[PDB]
Amino acid sequence: EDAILEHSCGGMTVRCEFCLSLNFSDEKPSDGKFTRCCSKGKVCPNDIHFPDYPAYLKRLMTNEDSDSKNFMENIRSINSSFAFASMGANIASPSGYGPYCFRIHGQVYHRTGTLHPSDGVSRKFAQLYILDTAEATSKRLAMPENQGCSERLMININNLMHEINELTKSYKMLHEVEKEAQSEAAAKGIAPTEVTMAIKYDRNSDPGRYNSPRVTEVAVIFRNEDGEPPFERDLLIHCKPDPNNPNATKMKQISILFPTLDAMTYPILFPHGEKGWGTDIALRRVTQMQYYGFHLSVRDTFNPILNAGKLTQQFIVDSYSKMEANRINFIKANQSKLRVEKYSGLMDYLKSRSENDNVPIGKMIILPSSFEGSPRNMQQRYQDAMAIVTKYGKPDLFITMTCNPKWADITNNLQRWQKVENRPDLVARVFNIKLNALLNDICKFHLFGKVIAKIHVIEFQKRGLPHAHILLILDSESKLRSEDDIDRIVKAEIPDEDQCPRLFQIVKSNMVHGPCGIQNPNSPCMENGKCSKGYPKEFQNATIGNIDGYPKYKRRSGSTMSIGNKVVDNTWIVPYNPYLCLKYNCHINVEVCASIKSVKYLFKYIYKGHDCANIQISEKNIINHDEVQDFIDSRYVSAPEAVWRLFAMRMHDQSHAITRLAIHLPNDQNLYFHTDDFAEVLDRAKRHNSTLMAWFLLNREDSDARNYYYWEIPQHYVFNNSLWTKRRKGGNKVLGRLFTVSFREPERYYLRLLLLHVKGAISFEDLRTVGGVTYDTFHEAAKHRGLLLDDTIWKDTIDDAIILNMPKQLRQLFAYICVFGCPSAADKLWDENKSHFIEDFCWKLHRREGACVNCEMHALNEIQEVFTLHGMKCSHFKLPDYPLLMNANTCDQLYEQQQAEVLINSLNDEQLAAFQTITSAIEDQTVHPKCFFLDGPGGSGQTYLYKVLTHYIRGRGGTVLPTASTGIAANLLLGGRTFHSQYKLPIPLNETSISRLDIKSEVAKTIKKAQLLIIDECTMASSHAINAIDRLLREIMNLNVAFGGKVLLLGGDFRQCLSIVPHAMRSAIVQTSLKYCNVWGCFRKLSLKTNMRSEDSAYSEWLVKLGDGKLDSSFHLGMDIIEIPHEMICNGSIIEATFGNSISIDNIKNISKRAILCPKNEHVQKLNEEILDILDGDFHTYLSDDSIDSTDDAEKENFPIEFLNSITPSGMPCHKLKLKVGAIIMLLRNLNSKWGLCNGTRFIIKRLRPNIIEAEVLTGSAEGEVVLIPRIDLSPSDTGLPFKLIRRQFPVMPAFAMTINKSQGQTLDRVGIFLPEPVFAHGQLYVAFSRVRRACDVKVKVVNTSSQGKLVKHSESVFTLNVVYREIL
DNA sequence: TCCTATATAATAAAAGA
Ligand SMILES: [Zn+2]
């Protein structure tokens, strides 16, 4: 009403003294000098006379001239025609002959390979194109109504350009060059060709509106590995021929950093030439951002850059691509190589340093790239956002705001000739002034109560309108716990027209409807559903009960208004707040979050880079109707985003910054040193102090610091130059976090516990000292303080095993408990029960109770084997230590040679050919990249080659080092190890990832000697992991050739499901795969598609077709629709058919192989319960104890134990496990991969007792050994959850039914697929069908729904969706 | 919206109330 007045910017009256520049009053900085317009007084024009803009072009740009309308419509084409330089593009040529240059979207482009390099080697060039987006007018353009600039206009501009432009004499215009290319083509008879670009639209857009001419009309499409804009692009200059000298070359190449590129590329914007602003005239030398900043500003004198219609959009989008690429490359080029080594190691090396010895010291570290989109930067932002939630608790309010193009402030400023779409600068500046005002109201004015913490991220839509998502964590006093509070903040109904007319109009247009969420929300094909026909229903109450985990607000039926000749009721009014909507006239949606799980989904807004789209380029021939089509997946940048990034405007803001503290052993710190300056490091080392060491000094000299614990010191002090100083500026609170340390180093784990609970430590000695008595080790000190976990559960588990009387298993149980579970005192258990553990060894070696030596040693050695695989040693656990024995893997050379000869004879013809190529490469002495990828359907053929190759190489005396991506795959291969263990790659795997293996370590020597390295499942391996293997191999060898010139055999099948990513769309997922990595070019493909099926050869052929998406028989009914063979479909209950009518303890072994597969985990849990009920037996309930590892005692209050019990994150055991004798169970942890236990290893329960479960292995090498599985501590694999849940439960899950993606490696004799809803991934259906060898053994049941079931109404046949991404295969 | 392989340790740079 009168009280609420719309926010007014106040006009552009204010101007800076240093330079004339019209700026809004709010934008003025505190100092009084505007940074963007002139960098204070630092930026000034050079003293060169500035020519006036030519009159004829100015009259055309304004509407005054008669032919002005035509000029504005064709500005993109006219500018390109008179330009002196061109951009290269790669397009396939029909008939093998193409014109030298072709026109795409109104800009001249030249085929890659038009200029052949004098060196004779052609650099790879990334592809960047400018796309018009609104090519709906192509049909009118094709029609000869005008669409030629009227001819007279072209002649008049051409005459003006020659008279006023000096460059014309030196360089020919593109329009003349294009004619010459056509003339050469005409003589050869090469046909004229037309090139067109199309975008497959994404499902995210404003409802019913996309690609609006008003929202955007120009964009850059670019493809690069990490989404960074490409530095290397091809620009070719055509030079007018000189009669005097034939030496001059017509084609020369200029890089993105050529000095006068701007004047050459865009002639209309700078007509006079390389004079005035076209030449370098910025003074006091000026960075690229500063130059663009000066030009894109509004001043009284006419500015060509902001008043040129479509060209203005192209200039801004092209300039952002050039500026970002130049900054990223310059920073990377000017980077010193850095190496990190511990202080103890460097000092030891220096004392024993060999004179004149060149040895690399330490591990290489690669510093992060500047671009925000790069993976490492994004991961840090997510971790920082997560800790604000952990400390301040669950978020209370989520608010989203979107720009309105018809806002009064944007319209009044625009001059009559300009249109909102043509000028991007005003939209970005007005939005920033408004967002800052709303942000201030919420926090500075305490709107919606006191706000403690805030996170805000701005993302641009395909239309290009900017929208910002804000999350607010309120203080405890104002937290919303009542229906009365929820109603005042959020309202979901149409306002009374008489009571509040202005509000009624704002709600009527901005928030009238929400797109119905039925497969496609934006598409208006569901016209009825699009407006007022959506999920919300008349609840009639605030009901903040989290029924579905989302509160449902009050909606009352019976109120409706007329919009677009339609009636929309209270069913669909997006939740809106009155004061905010009245003040800023734009769509503001306020929603309340009442579940911590709701944030888990919402936090993913901060994980994106640029918008992702799919573009297909087609070349067509007029003479004959021949078209060639190619598919490119590339990032998209709109014009409004580019102006936002070019100016210094923030895209992410967090209220509290985070400082990371360090936990280090007493003599080991971290020093980072440049490789060349080794001598300086020795002097610098004494001075360097890490955060922990500094804390000791602050305690020694300051009384006040004693009160705070080590974790809280960052909040009250700041670190500069290796010292801590008090902070008196009232600066942004910094939270402070301590990292988590793993049990692999026991002392460091004990140190973390002491720092968390001990305060006022003068020096390391004080931390160990407790109650006036020093203790020799950190572990002893912790026990006396009493901050250690109880070991009662472990003692009981060991006692039960002794009663069982099976000795070998008891020794294994001790190893599994110590490595995975954390035992405070392992030594005590071993000493008390030593006789029971070593009883078997005593009986065989020394008859009955004989007295001899090494009986204990033999027992300890068996336990040590499990420790070696995980990397721990017996000394760490304080067990008695005996020196390790030595054995040789190669064994008999004669035996390996004889076995190899027989295997070679049985190989198939395609297989034999592969053996010959791999053997030849090992013999060849030339230094050339030697990487081979073995393709072909996943199956028996690939494994047999690995066996024959290993035998042949061992026979010649060389060594092979087999490794595999998954634990189950590793068990099959001899001596299998997970590739993440062999090369010790970091678990997050960001772009800057380096292997932790030491160059001089014994393991490194083994990799150097090995002739061949084999990876069983490349499909699972991500691009980052393959890159890290390349760096380590290059470092160990002296060569710089890819992969150290070592033969590699990364066999894999790409039809199977790709590696899961936390959030991505089709365009995002394809780029991270091995195919889009740079090293892929060197790889040479060997094909092994010969099919090896014991029976039902027809079934194998059908599987390949489903995987390749070649089945198009029913595609006519719908896209991606296939028909299952009739015999397989089963109306009857899938449980009865797949597992058999009879399920009993007596016959469980016969039906053990069979299993049921379902797409979503929820359905799987329901099926498992029913089968368990039918089985005879008595239910035993094993409960679990769950805790959150935390740096703060209060953090536990925010997430209560009752909440932790309910959550069951993927890859973790259930809180309440119900199991009965004869059930099938699957291990969820690798444990001992070599012996047989793995990520699968399904077992049949034999006996169940408290604290111990006895099972028999149904799959893998063990095949029937009896293993006892103890409780172990399991932690969530994903980092999405804010807290780290440590839950101890038997690592087991009921396994009668498994999700399709958990069954990639298992082989099942009979399988039944139950599909409640259609599949949603890369290889989902293919994996489910592939498990069974023959067609008769698959039974499928489909539930009828909108997209699946009997799609033809009169046809009794069932159709299901098959999803395959064509680009990956 | 969903699905979840591996399973240990986490960067050099100035400046404000
Ligand atoms: Zn200025």
Side-chain angles (χ1 to χ4, degrees):
Chain A
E1 214 195 2
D2 57 341
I4 326 289
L5 295 175
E6 295 204 359
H7 169 259
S8 57
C9 288
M12 277 183 175
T13 315
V14 189
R15 55 243 294 103
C16 30
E17 178 187 0
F18 307 102
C19 91
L20 209 278
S21 173
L22 276 78
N23 292 141
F24 289 104
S25 56
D26 298 7
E27 298 168 338
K28 180 180 294 181
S30 56
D31 69 333
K33 316 175 193 301
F34 300 87
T35 58
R36 48 163 150 269
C37 63
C38 45
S39 198
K40 322 299 185 176
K42 288 182 288 180
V43 174
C44 289
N46 202 7
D47 201 13
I48 269 83
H49 153 254
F50 292 123
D52 60 320
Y53 195 79
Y56 180 55
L57 281 180
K58 183 179 178 179
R59 294 188 302 267
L60 283 164
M61 287 168 63
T62 55
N63 272 358
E64 320 301 317
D65 200 284
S66 61
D67 210 13
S68 61
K69 190 175 183 179
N70 206 359
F71 180 83
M72 298 304 290
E73 292 165 348
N74 286 355
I75 234 288
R76 284 270 311 273
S77 71
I78 295 178
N79 182 81
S80 180
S81 296
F82 299 122
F84 311 109
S86 61
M87 25 182 54
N90 210 187
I91 270 96
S93 162
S95 304
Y97 301 109
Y100 200 82
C101 70
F102 41 76
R103 287 188 69 103
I104 318 184
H105 281 260
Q107 189 187 15
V108 181
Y109 278 90
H110 71 261
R111 331 196 63 99
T112 314
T114 37
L115 192 267
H116 187 263
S118 56
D119 50 301
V121 180
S122 56
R123 313 130 303 270
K124 177 59 188 176
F125 278 115
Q127 307 165 4
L128 176 119
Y129 306 103
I130 324 287
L131 198 40
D132 195 36
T133 79
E135 207 54 38
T137 64
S138 62
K139 307 301 178 59
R140 181 179 180 274
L141 186 132
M143 266 49 176
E145 183 72 23
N146 301 351
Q147 307 309 119
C149 100
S150 96
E151 167 257 2
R152 175 200 50 180
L153 179 62
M154 203 74 163
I155 303 178
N156 301 345
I157 303 179
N158 201 10
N159 300 354
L160 177 67
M161 200 71 61
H162 277 280
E163 301 153 353
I164 73 182
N165 200 344
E166 38 92 15
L167 279 180
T168 64
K169 314 142 193 169
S170 53
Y171 301 101
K172 57 169 162 300
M173 305 176 179
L174 287 178
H175 80 95
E176 340 167 4
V177 175
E178 178 187 350
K179 301 178 182 176
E180 302 172 3
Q182 292 187 1
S183 172
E184 167 177 330
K188 301 180 178 178
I190 305 179
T193 51
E194 164 188 347
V195 222
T196 56
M197 293 184 70
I199 317 105
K200 308 302 152 298
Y201 205 60
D202 66 331
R203 279 312 93 192
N204 299 343
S205 76
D206 271 342
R209 302 295 180 269
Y210 53 93
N211 193 7
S212 149
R214 302 158 280 101
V215 297
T216 191
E217 255 173 347
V218 160
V220 284
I221 272 78
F222 64 92
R223 179 178 55 179
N224 230 195
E225 46 171 356
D226 286 353
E228 305 174 0
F231 182 78
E232 17 97 16
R233 304 183 300 107
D234 211 11
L235 285 320
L236 255 297
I237 51 172
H238 319 98
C239 313
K240 277 175 58 183
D242 182 33
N244 308 345
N245 214 9
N247 301 358
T249 313
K250 298 178 180 177
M251 319 285 298
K252 299 176 180 182
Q253 294 201 354
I254 56 169
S255 59
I256 201 179
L257 48 97
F258 181 78
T260 60
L261 194 130
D262 266 334
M264 288 193 179
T265 45
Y266 301 105
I268 305 295
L269 289 183
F270 310 102
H272 272 82
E274 291 179 5
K275 295 180 182 178
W277 274 281
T279 196
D280 306 53
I281 226 58
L283 197 66
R284 304 159 55 184
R285 332 186 190 186
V286 153
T287 74
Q288 277 194 348
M289 276 191 55
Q290 292 164 354
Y291 170 77
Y292 291 130
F294 189 80
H295 277 280
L296 303 165
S297 178
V298 189
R299 48 185 90 260
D300 53 349
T301 66
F302 189 79
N303 189 18
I305 322 289
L306 287 176
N307 292 176
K310 278 200 180 187
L311 206 56
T312 297
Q313 293 170 286
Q314 184 189 350
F315 181 76
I316 298 184
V317 204
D318 201 21
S319 297
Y320 165 68
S321 171
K322 300 187 295 181
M323 186 269 301
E324 198 76 22
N326 198 21
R327 183 172 64 186
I328 296 175
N329 198 50
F330 163 73
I331 292 302
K332 283 185 179 175
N334 198 7
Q335 274 301 333
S336 305
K337 308 307 167 187
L338 265 170
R339 307 278 293 187
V340 44
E341 189 56 271
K342 305 179 179 183
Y343 166 82
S344 59
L346 278 182
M347 192 56 63
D348 180 35
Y349 166 79
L350 271 154
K351 297 308 182 182
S352 308
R353 187 170 56 176
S354 301
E355 295 84 11
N356 302 346
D357 191 15
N358 184 22
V359 42
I361 321 120
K363 316 169 186 59
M364 184 183 181
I365 60 171
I366 310 176
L367 294 177
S369 49
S370 59
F371 190 50
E372 297 184 349
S374 68
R376 191 189 185 96
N377 295 4
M378 301 190 306
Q379 295 178 1
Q380 305 292 340
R381 296 199 306 267
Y382 192 62
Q383 289 183 177
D384 290 345
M386 282 193 303
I388 302 182
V389 154
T390 69
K391 184 74 173 186
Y392 301 108
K394 176 201 80 278
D396 295 352
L397 215 60
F398 171 73
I399 302 184
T400 165
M401 193 180 74
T402 312
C403 172
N404 195 28
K406 300 92 180 180
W407 263 333
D409 299 350
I410 308 183
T411 301
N412 302 342
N413 306 328
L414 293 176
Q415 304 281 347
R416 303 156 302 270
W417 61 93
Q418 308 146 0
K419 292 301 182 181
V420 51
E421 21 173 318
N422 305 348
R423 282 195 44 177
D425 64 321
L426 208 44
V427 177
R429 298 209 293 186
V430 170
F431 186 79
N432 200 16
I433 300 180
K434 290 196 185 308
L435 185 59
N436 289 358
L438 170 68
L439 286 175
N440 289 351
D441 292 356
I442 319 297
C443 180
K444 312 300 172 54
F445 296 91
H446 304 106
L447 191 54
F448 312 124
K450 169 66 184 177
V451 178
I452 298 291
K454 172 185 66 64
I455 313 176
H456 102 79
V457 42
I458 308 178
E459 59 151 20
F460 293 85
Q461 216 182 30
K462 282 294 193 63
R463 297 188 80 193
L465 298 177
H467 32 89
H469 303 274
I470 318 171
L471 189 73
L472 308 155
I473 313 182
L474 301 176
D475 191 25
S476 59
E477 307 168 352
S478 300
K479 197 159 294 292
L480 307 177
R481 298 148 303 182
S482 74
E483 275 96 354
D484 296 357
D485 294 351
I486 256 208
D487 285 335
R488 182 176 306 268
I489 298 193
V490 307
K491 304 184 178 302
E493 302 181 19
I494 198 67
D496 194 356
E497 196 172 15
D498 298 354
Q499 298 300 317
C500 295
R502 188 201 302 180
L503 186 57
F504 179 87
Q505 302 152 5
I506 300 180
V507 181
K508 177 179 180 183
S509 312
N510 306 348
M511 288 151 308
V512 32
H513 73 86
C516 48
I518 324 177
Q519 176 190 359
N520 293 339
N522 4 75
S523 185
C525 300
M526 18 194 60
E527 183 181 1
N528 55 336
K530 239 258 301 176
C531 179
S532 200
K533 283 194 191 60
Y535 30 98
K537 302 177 185 305
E538 278 81 11
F539 326 104
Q540 218 179 359
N541 192 30
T543 184
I544 178 195
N546 263 183
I547 312 103
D548 59 328
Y550 301 105
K552 303 177 167 186
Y553 322 95
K554 183 207 304 182
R555 298 180 185 266
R556 286 172 297 182
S557 58
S559 300
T560 178
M561 67 284 190
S562 183
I563 306 183
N565 295 357
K566 294 173 188 177
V567 266
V568 23
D569 53 316
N570 268 352
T571 200
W572 235 135
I573 302 293
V574 188
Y576 71 95
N577 173 276
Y579 167 74
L580 293 190
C581 286
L582 280 173
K583 188 173 182 178
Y584 316 104
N585 186 15
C586 51
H587 149 244
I588 302 180
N589 170 30
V590 189
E591 287 180 356
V592 185
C593 295
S595 195
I596 318 177
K597 82 187 57 181
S598 86
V599 86
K600 175 207 58 59
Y601 166 52
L602 256 56
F603 236 167
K604 288 182 300 187
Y605 51 47
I606 57 200
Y607 239 115
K608 202 178 64 63
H610 290 297
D611 216 340
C612 306
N614 196 2
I615 288 88
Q616 185 180 22
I617 311 185
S618 177
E619 179 74 281
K620 316 181 174 185
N621 179 17
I622 317 295
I623 295 197
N624 39 65
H625 23 266
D626 298 4
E627 301 181 357
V628 184
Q629 301 180 8
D630 184 28
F631 254 111
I632 305 170
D633 258 319
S634 27
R635 298 203 183 263
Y636 173 103
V637 173
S638 59
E641 183 178 2
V643 69
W644 190 280
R645 295 168 163 267
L646 278 178
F647 292 148
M649 294 201 185
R650 294 187 62 92
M651 305 203 70
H652 179 56
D653 180 29
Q654 292 185 6
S655 54
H656 303 284
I658 304 197
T659 305
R660 281 88 177 269
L661 298 175
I663 312 175
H664 72 290
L665 287 175
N667 212 13
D668 302 355
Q669 324 159 5
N670 255 357
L671 294 169
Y672 310 95
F673 63 94
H674 311 100
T675 76
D676 307 336
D677 309 340
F678 192 70
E680 299 180 356
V681 181
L682 169 65
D683 200 16
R684 201 197 67 179
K686 303 105 178 180
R687 300 186 297 268
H688 181 78
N689 294 328
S690 53
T691 54
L692 179 56
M693 293 162 55
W695 177 51
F696 297 130
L697 299 180
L698 184 59
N699 279 339
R700 200 172 312 170
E701 315 164 2
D702 180 33
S703 65
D704 309 341
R706 305 290 184 88
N707 309 350
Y708 309 116
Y709 280 111
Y710 177 58
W711 44 284
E712 279 181 352
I713 286 290
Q715 301 185 17
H716 305 87
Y717 297 91
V718 57
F719 195 71
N720 254 351
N721 290 356
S722 77
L723 259 178
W724 286 101
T725 147
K726 195 155 300 180
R727 179 179 315 188
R728 44 200 163 268
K729 59 184 180 181
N732 59 322
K733 323 92 183 181
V734 276
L735 271 191
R737 203 165 104 265
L738 268 165
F739 282 132
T740 63
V741 293
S742 296
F743 198 22
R744 304 292 168 264
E745 179 52 68
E747 294 296 324
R748 219 175 74 173
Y749 170 74
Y750 293 112
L751 182 58
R752 180 174 183 266
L753 288 177
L754 283 183
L755 286 181
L756 282 176
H757 301 285
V758 176
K759 61 222 306 180
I762 61 182
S763 286
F764 263 116
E765 328 283 343
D766 200 14
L767 269 173
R768 284 195 302 267
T769 308
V770 183
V773 182
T774 70
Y775 294 113
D776 297 354
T777 82
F778 288 97
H779 159 254
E780 290 193 0
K783 297 199 310 180
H784 291 97
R785 293 195 184 267
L787 27 113
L788 81 150
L789 303 174
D790 196 15
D791 58 349
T792 294
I793 310 179
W794 307 132
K795 301 186 176 180
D796 302 348
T797 304
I798 266 80
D799 290 348
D800 277 13
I802 301 174
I803 306 176
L804 288 184
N805 211 16
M806 316 160 60
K808 185 175 179 183
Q809 282 76 22
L810 166 64
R811 289 185 304 271
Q812 300 290 332
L813 181 125
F814 181 78
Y816 306 136
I817 281 193
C818 293
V819 168
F820 274 89
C822 46
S824 58
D827 186 36
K828 294 186 178 180
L829 298 174
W830 177 258
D831 194 24
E832 295 174 13
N833 310 311
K834 191 177 304 183
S835 62
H836 307 289
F837 283 89
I838 70 178
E839 182 184 0
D840 153 65
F841 282 93
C842 186
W843 199 94
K844 48 170 187 177
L845 300 166
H846 357 110
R847 199 42 215 94
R848 238 290 74 139
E849 282 128 7
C852 201
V853 294
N854 279 6
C855 170
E856 185 175 357
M857 185 266 167
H858 293 138
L860 224 279
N861 192 207
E862 175 180 352
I863 304 187
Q864 175 65 37
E865 301 164 1
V866 185
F867 290 3
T868 306
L869 279 132
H870 303 285
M872 310 201 60
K873 295 177 180 178
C874 57
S875 62
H876 294 115
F877 289 107
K878 293 180 179 300
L879 296 175
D881 181 29
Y882 304 99
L884 304 180
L885 294 180
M886 37 176 58
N887 289 315
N889 205 18
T890 171
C891 71
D892 186 28
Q893 192 108 329
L894 183 60
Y895 164 76
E896 308 289 343
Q897 181 70 29
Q898 292 174 341
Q899 283 274 346
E901 306 156 4
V902 182
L903 293 178
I904 291 172
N905 308 326
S906 57
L907 282 166
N908 299 355
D909 288 0
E910 264 192 8
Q911 298 175 343
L912 184 62
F915 177 82
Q916 296 194 0
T917 311
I918 305 295
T919 292
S920 179
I922 303 175
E923 303 165 347
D924 188 15
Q925 310 289 337
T926 310
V927 185
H928 191 261
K930 293 168 181 177
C931 315
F932 302 87
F933 158 72
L934 181 67
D935 207 359
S940 48
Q942 295 174 10
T943 67
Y944 200 63
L945 249 178
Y946 301 139
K947 297 185 178 179
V948 58
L949 275 162
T950 302
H951 273 83
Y952 172 77
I953 302 178
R954 289 189 179 178
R956 298 200 312 183
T959 55
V960 208
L961 195 61
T963 189
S965 295
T966 57
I968 322 176
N971 201 19
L972 311 171
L973 305 178
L974 185 60
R977 287 281 300 270
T978 50
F979 90 100
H980 285 99
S981 180
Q982 182 80 45
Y983 305 96
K984 299 189 184 306
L985 306 178
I987 296 305
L989 272 174
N990 42 24
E991 45 161 3
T992 56
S993 60
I994 190 68
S995 52
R996 300 162 176 171
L997 255 184
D998 179 36
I999 348 162
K1000 301 295 298 177
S1001 67
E1002 283 287 342
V1003 182
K1005 307 176 183 178
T1006 313
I1007 316 185
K1008 191 165 188 170
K1009 176 190 176 180
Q1011 277 80 6
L1012 176 67
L1013 305 174
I1014 299 177
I1015 299 190
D1016 205 14
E1017 292 192 8
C1018 76
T1019 156
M1020 305 302 297
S1022 63
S1023 61
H1024 306 107
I1026 278 319
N1027 291 4
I1029 306 291
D1030 147 73
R1031 304 190 183 100
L1032 173 63
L1033 289 183
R1034 278 181 175 178
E1035 191 184 16
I1036 66 174
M1037 292 306 192
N1038 296 352
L1039 304 170
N1040 208 191
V1041 56
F1043 288 102
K1046 306 174 64 63
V1047 191
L1048 252 65
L1049 196 48
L1050 266 65
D1053 188 23
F1054 273 90
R1055 299 167 176 92
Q1056 290 187 0
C1057 305
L1058 303 172
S1059 177
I1060 168 71
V1061 273
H1063 203 76
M1065 295 300 297
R1066 173 211 291 262
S1067 303
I1069 200 178
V1070 300
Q1071 299 181 12
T1072 59
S1073 76
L1074 296 183
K1075 295 310 194 72
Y1076 287 70
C1077 93
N1078 58 331
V1079 222
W1080 220 83
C1082 74
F1083 276 92
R1084 312 159 52 173
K1085 296 184 59 175
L1086 304 176
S1087 57
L1088 229 194
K1089 295 182 185 175
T1090 291
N1091 282 358
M1092 292 305 292
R1093 46 275 167 112
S1094 61
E1095 209 174 356
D1096 211 333
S1097 61
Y1099 187 55
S1100 179
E1101 298 180 5
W1102 186 71
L1103 288 181
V1104 179
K1105 296 178 179 179
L1106 201 142
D1108 303 355
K1110 292 300 183 180
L1111 291 176
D1112 296 343
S1113 65
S1114 294
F1115 257 49
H1116 68 280
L1117 306 166
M1119 185 185 299
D1120 285 354
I1121 294 296
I1122 63 160
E1123 180 181 351
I1124 330 175
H1126 65 283
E1127 299 173 354
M1128 298 169 53
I1129 319 176
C1130 190
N1131 53 350
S1133 167
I1134 195 66
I1135 299 186
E1136 309 166 354
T1138 310
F1139 262 98
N1141 58 339
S1142 175
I1143 306 179
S1144 76
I1145 305 182
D1146 319 326
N1147 70 341
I1148 192 65
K1149 47 182 180 182
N1150 305 347
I1151 64 180
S1152 65
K1153 283 288 181 179
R1154 310 177 179 184
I1156 305 180
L1157 287 179
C1158 297
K1160 298 183 71 68
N1161 209 189
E1162 179 58 43
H1163 305 281
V1164 161
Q1165 291 185 349
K1166 300 179 177 177
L1167 278 198
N1168 281 345
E1169 288 187 0
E1170 307 169 6
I1171 309 190
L1172 277 170
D1173 291 5
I1174 306 178
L1175 181 62
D1176 56 314
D1178 184 34
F1179 266 99
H1180 304 287
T1181 295
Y1182 291 110
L1183 287 179
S1184 66
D1185 42 296
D1186 49 359
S1187 58
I1188 293 312
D1189 186 18
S1190 169
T1191 64
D1192 187 18
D1193 298 355
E1195 175 176 333
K1196 297 183 180 181
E1197 307 171 7
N1198 298 343
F1199 312 102
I1201 303 294
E1202 288 82 13
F1203 175 76
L1204 310 178
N1205 296 305
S1206 303
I1207 306 296
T1208 46
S1210 176
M1212 286 198 61
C1214 320
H1215 157 73
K1216 180 180 301 180
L1217 190 71
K1218 291 184 176 180
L1219 286 180
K1220 318 173 66 172
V1221 173
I1224 302 184
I1225 51 176
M1226 176 179 301
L1227 232 171
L1228 304 174
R1229 216 46 185 256
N1230 296 359
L1231 287 193
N1232 194 349
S1233 60
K1234 199 166 300 300
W1235 191 85
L1237 304 179
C1238 294
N1239 213 4
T1241 325
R1242 307 183 297 106
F1243 304 110
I1244 269 179
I1245 302 185
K1246 291 314 190 66
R1247 286 194 298 175
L1248 276 160
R1249 259 179 337 269
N1251 300 345
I1252 184 161
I1253 295 187
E1254 324 186 3
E1256 175 176 349
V1257 196
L1258 295 178
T1259 179
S1261 62
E1263 210 59 36
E1265 302 280 341
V1266 178
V1267 204
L1268 313 174
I1269 334 165
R1271 305 201 181 194
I1272 62 174
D1273 287 27
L1274 286 335
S1275 62
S1277 170
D1278 69 80
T1279 64
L1281 290 180
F1283 43 80
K1284 185 178 184 177
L1285 233 174
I1286 302 190
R1287 179 177 303 176
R1288 48 175 59 180
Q1289 228 286 323
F1290 296 97
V1292 126
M1293 165 195 175
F1296 290 112
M1298 308 166 299
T1299 68
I1300 37 200
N1301 301 10
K1302 187 67 179 184
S1303 64
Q1304 290 182 16
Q1306 280 296 304
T1307 302
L1308 319 159
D1309 294 2
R1310 174 189 290 185
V1311 80
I1313 316 175
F1314 171 64
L1315 290 168
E1317 288 181 5
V1319 298
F1320 38 81
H1322 176 77
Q1324 270 192 343
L1325 218 47
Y1326 173 62
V1327 171
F1329 285 115
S1330 63
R1331 302 302 99 204
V1332 276
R1333 295 179 184 91
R1334 303 176 302 177
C1336 56
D1337 295 346
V1338 222
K1339 293 290 186 170
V1340 183
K1341 173 183 177 181
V1342 178
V1343 178
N1344 277 221
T1345 74
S1346 62
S1347 53
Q1348 73 181 11
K1350 307 187 306 175
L1351 296 187
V1352 188
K1353 48 163 299 182
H1354 210 84
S1355 176
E1356 295 280 352
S1357 180
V1358 175
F1359 312 96
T1360 174
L1361 194 83
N1362 174 24
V1363 181
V1364 171
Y1365 290 161
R1366 272 75 183 178
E1367 310 91 2
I1368 287 301
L1369 180 55

